[PDB]
């Protein structure tokens with residue numbers, strides 16, 4: 088669609104800046120469990136994607152995604168309500184543009200949640216697995232979101248992903264969980280992206296687990312790559328919405344409903360957690 | 370290619386339904402070892418893909434063969450669409466979704482695969498009990514794109530993708546028919562291809578828990594499972610994968626075809642005998 | 650861009666053949682040599698109709714042999730198509746290339762590797778290829794090769810043996826390893842988790858290039874010699890403060906790598 092180059096991203100950023108006076112410091116990509124956080128944003132300005140020229144379009148059953156501006160724990164945020172998952176067939180530019188817009192809008196930290204299957208056998212339903220690293224299967228293939236001409240305006244041709252999941256933010260998130268009595272739910276792990284949209288087969292899960300993957304999802308990494316590429320610090324957490332089935336004999340099967348259910352059930356806690364992290368961001 | 374949506378798929382199915390009075394309950398995708406299967410089909414009509422508007426075209430044209438096999442109404446796909454050929458997701462998906470509309474409840478598919486598992490012998494049958502969809506994991510899943518809701522859910526689970534009941538039946542059929550010793554169950558990994566796997570790739574795949582490696586089938590399986598078609602899939606081990614970079618052994622497509630053809634009669638009989646035994 | 654079929658490749662080859670009399674026997678792709686080939690004819694890509702543009706084809710003699718040096722690669726992470734990446738290699742085939750020598754930069758996965766080490770590729774793991782981004786995906790160009798190429802001895806064992814002997818006799822055999830190159834489509838460097846996974850996949854070095862060219866080369870019957878310069882040691886622990894294209898390691902080893910290539914070419918069998 089529209090190339091996530093500086094010209095287009097500026098155009099979109101400027102259109103947004105006309106619509107809100109909130110200069111976001113924190114971008115929040117609303118994933119599993121963050122539905123309430125998005126909702127609890129203070130003094131919020133809600134801008135439907137449909138109202139932002141050249142902003143990529145996505146919907147939940149026809150309802151446009153929204154950019155939500157306002158504050159959260161006294162910090163200025165922009166919340167993306169409505170993501171651009173690659174299994175939907177969105178282009179690299181589509182996925183990248185909103186993140187690069189965040190960059191120009193002033194976002195310094197991106198916080199993202201997602202739903203993931205627990206590969207690591209110690210994980211429990213409802214666990215939070217803070218991403219400390221990832222395995223970008225599509226990226227290792229030739230489906231890295233950065234494939235194509237590099238937009239030098241945003242980042243370097245060969246971005247390193249050394250400390251992609253900012254260790255300081257991870258430490259803070261863990262501390263906030265600990266201080267608030269749910270440190271036991273919080274783990275740190277390697278998230279592997281399956282392009283999807285099929286859930287992983289038991290053989291695939293077994294393989295991924297053996298690759299050193301703790302959780303598996305179909306999202307997030309592309310956004311993270313774009314965020315890191317343009318120098319936005321990233322905090323990302325997977326909500327373990329289901330325990331990956333490694334056994335082909337099992338009759339138990341992953342399903343989006345239980346994924347949604349776990350997200351819905353953990354939303355209040357995840358909101359509290361994110362709000363309390365935001366409150367303590369440097 | 371034309372989108373494998375319900376409107377287009379309906380149109381194709383409807384055109385086909387005007388060409389045959391046979392409501393197939395079993396879809397068969399002929400892969401390695403399934404050459405002489407079309408012959409065994411009775412009350413059969415052969416519909417060249419060329420005769421079906423908006424049906425994908427592949428090679429002589431591919432044929433949609435309807436008729437009765439072992440007392441059961443079948444549609445047999447003669448000519449498949451392999452992703453390494455550059456076919457689109459929609460192209461590969463449409464025939465399976467057409468099968469769905471035509472009434473197919475079970476998809477039976479054979480393919481040729483390299484034997485990674487070191488206990489496999491040339492000419493063995495490896496019933497797929499699971500798969501590793503390397504292209505799918507890497508963002509080339511056949512279902513990438515808007516989900517066609519008339520067919521299935523956005524995020525299909527693949528848990529019993531290779532129907533355990535069909536697998537059990539296939540194994541029982543092989544055993545009672547004296548070739549149980551040829552039959553394994555294993556994990557099929559898809560290499561997009563069209564290169565055979567390097568020794569290093571094979572070693573990696575074997576260590577990933579893969580028993581056989583092929584360049585086909587998974588995309589159809591995914592589409593079949595997405596739209597609720599039960600799947601039975603078997604790989605004929607047409608060659609033993611070479612894991613050793615120092616080895617002079619190597620896959621050869623002619624030998625692969627030869628091995629497949631050699632097993633064709635047995636594979637046919639097996640499929641026929643499985644179909645005969647399917648619950649009615 | 651233009652389909653890397655026999656017609657288009659012929660057009661380009663024929664064109665190049667008007668611009669030079671040099672029939673190359675060896676094709677060379679330097680990643681991390683061309684600056685020093687005798688009686689060199691420097692052909693800018695821009696001067697070659699239908700030829701991909703990013704860039705020079707440098708024809709001439711190297712260590713007594715006619716070579717074509719490809720200066721300027723087409724990397725998949727750049728968004729170049731399969732046909733674009735393949736065409737230069739198929740052009741080489743048409744030009745007379747029988748041996749392709751390629752060097753590249755790679756991260757050292759194998760823990761025994763040191764910065765500046767040479768890892769001769771003896772095999773590869775084509776992650777994009779396994780995942781449906783194989784350069785050969787699409788109609789097979791039958792004039793060049795078969796539909797399903799085997800990749801047996803893809804990294805010609807005799808050439809590897811020779812390269813090792815040359816390194817040995819020239820007193821830098823200590824630097825030379827052989828191993829498996831895995832391609833990450835890129836352009837991101839691999840995360841520690843990814844490196845760990847790749848290492849455990851049996852990968853010794855990781856880069857973002859080369860395999861597609863090698864695949865095309867093998868597809869059309871060109872012998873391949875490929876070496877990775879270990880330009881950095883892959884970080885496997887996400888807890889480290891250590892990947893950067895600022896490297897540099899290539900500059901350090903440039904003259905050595907170049908001398909090695911020259912000396913290999915010197916010893917190559919000649920029909």
Ligand code: HPA
Pocket residue numbers: 202203204205281286287303304305328329331341346
């Ligand atoms: O098990 C899963 N696999 C992939 N994505 C997911 N999103 C939540 N659960 C899963």
Ligand code: HPA
Pocket residue numbers: 481482483484560564565566582583584607608610620625
């Ligand atoms: O060894 C193989 N690898 C990939 N596909 C195949 N089809 C038959 N044998 C093979």
Ligand code: HPA
Pocket residue numbers: 754755756757833837838839855856857880881883892
């Ligand atoms: O560590 C690496 N990864 C990918 N490509 C490379 N080229 C130089 N080093 C690397």
